[PDB]
Design an enzyme around this catalytic site. Structure first.
Site, PDB file in Angstrom:
ATOM      1  N   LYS A   1      46.398  -4.001  49.506  1.00  0.00           N
ATOM      2  CA  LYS A   1      45.353  -3.812  48.499  1.00  0.00           C
ATOM      3  C   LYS A   1      44.354  -2.838  49.111  1.00  0.00           C
ATOM      4  O   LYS A   1      43.996  -2.956  50.285  1.00  0.00           O
ATOM      5  CB  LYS A   1      44.663  -5.136  48.169  1.00  0.00           C
ATOM      6  CG  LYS A   1      44.733  -5.513  46.705  1.00  0.00           C
ATOM      7  CD  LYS A   1      43.630  -6.490  46.318  1.00  0.00           C
ATOM      8  CE  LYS A   1      42.617  -5.840  45.379  1.00  0.00           C
ATOM      9  NZ  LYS A   1      42.157  -6.768  44.305  1.00  0.00           N
TER      10      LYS A   1
ATOM     11  N   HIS B   1      40.247 -14.190  46.410  1.00  0.00           N
ATOM     12  CA  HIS B   1      38.834 -13.983  46.693  1.00  0.00           C
ATOM     13  C   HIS B   1      38.021 -15.113  47.287  1.00  0.00           C
ATOM     14  O   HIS B   1      36.798 -14.995  47.394  1.00  0.00           O
ATOM     15  CB  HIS B   1      38.143 -13.527  45.406  1.00  0.00           C
ATOM     16  CG  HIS B   1      38.705 -12.265  44.842  1.00  0.00           C
ATOM     17  ND1 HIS B   1      38.573 -11.049  45.471  1.00  0.00           N
ATOM     18  CD2 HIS B   1      39.405 -12.029  43.707  1.00  0.00           C
ATOM     19  CE1 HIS B   1      39.161 -10.114  44.749  1.00  0.00           C
ATOM     20  NE2 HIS B   1      39.674 -10.684  43.674  1.00  0.00           N
TER      21      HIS B   1
ATOM     22  N   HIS C   1      38.380 -13.403  37.583  1.00  0.00           N
ATOM     23  CA  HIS C   1      38.384 -12.005  37.990  1.00  0.00           C
ATOM     24  C   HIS C   1      37.098 -11.624  38.729  1.00  0.00           C
ATOM     25  O   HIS C   1      35.994 -11.992  38.315  1.00  0.00           O
ATOM     26  CB  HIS C   1      38.558 -11.114  36.745  1.00  0.00           C
ATOM     27  CG  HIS C   1      38.233  -9.671  36.971  1.00  0.00           C
ATOM     28  ND1 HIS C   1      39.123  -8.789  37.542  1.00  0.00           N
ATOM     29  CD2 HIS C   1      37.118  -8.953  36.689  1.00  0.00           C
ATOM     30  CE1 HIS C   1      38.571  -7.589  37.606  1.00  0.00           C
ATOM     31  NE2 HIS C   1      37.354  -7.664  37.094  1.00  0.00           N
TER      32      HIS C   1
END
Length: 123
Positions: free
Chosen positions: A40, A13, A114
């Site tokens: 993904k 990310h 996350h």
């Protein structure tokens, strides 16, 4: 364990300086970060300096969110890559959407581990 969850978060990310944030950017970075086997479905990359992202885990740049998450006080430039097509296997076609807003993460030992992708899901 360790800080491997944090480095995986960065791998999936974080992209400091984008350059073109177009469809082709998505296809390239997704392959580059090893998120193409399988492809993904949707993945967002945060841009800018790492310090601000880390700060979301402190009161300096974050607010409690829902059950166990944190939402950033500051806005971030982000680029969301959405898979176009029906196959989970390469070639992976992605559509890019550049954005600017706060982000929601989960922190562990003071580090983001996350990214909540739901907020970048535009149904």
């Amino acid at each position: 364990q360790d800080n491997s969850r944090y480095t995986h978060f960065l791998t999936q990310h974080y992209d400091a300086k984008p350059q073109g944030r177009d469809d082709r950017y998505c296809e390239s970075i997704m392959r580059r970060r090893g998120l193409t086997s399988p492809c993904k479905d949707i993945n967002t990359f945060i841009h800018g300096n790492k310090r601000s992202i880390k700060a979301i885990c402190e009161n300096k740049n974050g607010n409690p969110h829902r059950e166990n998450l944190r939402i950033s006080k500051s806005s971030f430039q982000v680029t969301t890559c959405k898979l176009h097509g029906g196959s989970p296997w390469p070639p992976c076609q992605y559509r890019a959407t550049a954005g600017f807003r706060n982000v929601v993460v989960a922190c562990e030992n003071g580090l983001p581990v996350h990214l909540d992708q739901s907020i970048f899901r535009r149904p």
